[PDB]
Symmetry: C3
Subunit: 203 residues, 3 copies
């Protein structure tokens, strides 16, 4: 009877389900917070996998200040059992002595450290101190990494980075809402999500 409603329901479902298709895009954003109240975002869209290393100079604010921390926003059909973040030293090392450092540290940020912001999204806050660097790994949920599919995955995976400067958190927040990505505001509230709702937050 109410096919107008049914169609809108299917559209909502479609939006929530499209990211699970094999060549769907994923979106990871690293929001850097500065004492000034300003933010800088490193926004990555990618279809298969993302490996990020933000060096200490990239993390600096225009004024030259280092960030208090980052909000790392994971969005899409990401394998949550392998999604991870760690704050390394100025050299990108998780042990001061490189001879005993590894690809990832024994206390890498993962598991339930990533907060649920919807079925499509996780977010985590990571405090930083001076000269810290940031590493992020996100991979598509399995396999495109097996045997013959690995070839297409390698050549198909074009990571598209953007760096965005925000004057205030309000700008970050509205950016996140309109980009449909998880964000955690300064009070710790989840104020943006990838999940589409047919009536918004009506309940």
């Amino acid at each position: 009877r109410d096919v107008r409603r049914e169609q809108q329901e299917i559209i909502t479902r479609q939006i929530n389900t499209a990211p699970y298709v094999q060549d769907a895009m994923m979106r990871v954003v690293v929001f850097a917070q500065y004492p000034s109240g300003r933010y800088k975002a490193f926004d990555y869209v990618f279809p298969d996998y993302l490996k990020v290393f933000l060096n200490w100079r990239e993390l600096l604010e225009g004024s030259g200040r280092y960030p208090m921390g980052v909000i790392v926003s994971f969005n899409g059909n990401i394998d949550w059992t392998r999604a991870r973040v760690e704050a390394t030293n100025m050299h990108g090392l998780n042990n001061t002595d490189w001879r005993e450092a590894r690809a990832w540290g024994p206390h890498v940020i993962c598991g339930n450290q990533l907060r649920k912001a919807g079925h499509l999204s996780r977010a985590v806050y990571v405090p930083l101190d001076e000269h810290n660097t940031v590493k992020v790994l996100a991979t598509a949920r399995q396999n495109r990494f097996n045997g013959p599919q690995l070839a297409q995955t390698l050549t198909n995976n074009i990571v598209c980075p953007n760096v965005i400067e925000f004057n205030t958190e309000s700008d970050v927040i509205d950016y996140a809402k309109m980009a449909h990505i998880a964000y955690i505001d300064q009070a710790g509230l989840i104020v943006a999500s990838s999940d589409a709702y047919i009536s918004g937050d009506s309940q």
Copy 2:
């Protein structure tokens, strides 16, 4: 009898055939055209595959102007059935809503949209508007992407980018001729090619 001629013929053939050897170099160039009449070239040489994303700030002219469009020049033993280009939005997305965007769009630039500039070369003009971004994919013609060869291909593939600024199209044109790469001049003529001719354009 005329072995001097035969040898020159073999040299011509060798030049035209060398790019088809498995570890041969390929060359893709993105020529950005600005209203000023100036051009900027993103010149990539690579042995196996190339994935390019040019962000909106990279595409800007020194003055700060955005390009009218790009000429994408494909050269070498490229798989023409998979070679492609697309103009994405400022975020590198082919759908404004990332949740319904994909690795490549439903109308990606490919097939006979790429103009033949010789057996070794294709070229295509792509008009751009403000904040557009550019994505290019080029892969070596099959397999180096199969099973055990994929390992060497991954580690062997060092993409060597150069960014070159030109004052006038004449500079672009002579650059393309001497670099043996396809280029399409402002009148739409193919004025450069990778194909070697023993007597030049003598017919």
Copy 3:
């Protein structure tokens, strides 16, 4: 009896052996030497493989001078049979004519051209002239590149680059000693190494 000594011996061994674990970090550094007496270092840490192309503008000193040459320092569980360096032209080509250029040149720098600086380290000096570019390849000693392991290797390999400016060679030298990496001083002496010694250079 002397378990204090034994433990220190095991610690020394552990430091020397840790880099051979499958997810251990490797470290490659390209030290650029300028006529000014200043140096610039491109310092890479990575777990699986490293592909480097330093373009001519990256190689320039702040003043705008080109380097006299580079010291390439290889450290870790590197496959010394495949480790290599070459100085290409401004375009990253090992043949002026790209149609006859290849992934690596017929006289690529490898084998015993790399000087032994310990069981963990090799180093080589490479003179450069204006507009030369530099290519480096280093891979973990086998296999993580075979079949099903290639997937993890691809996603696990986050290369962490740092660019460091030094005022004098003395600064470079002490940097190399404290970073436990091979370096060859201006007299040609090996003055730094990754190898840990329980009593230092006491013999």
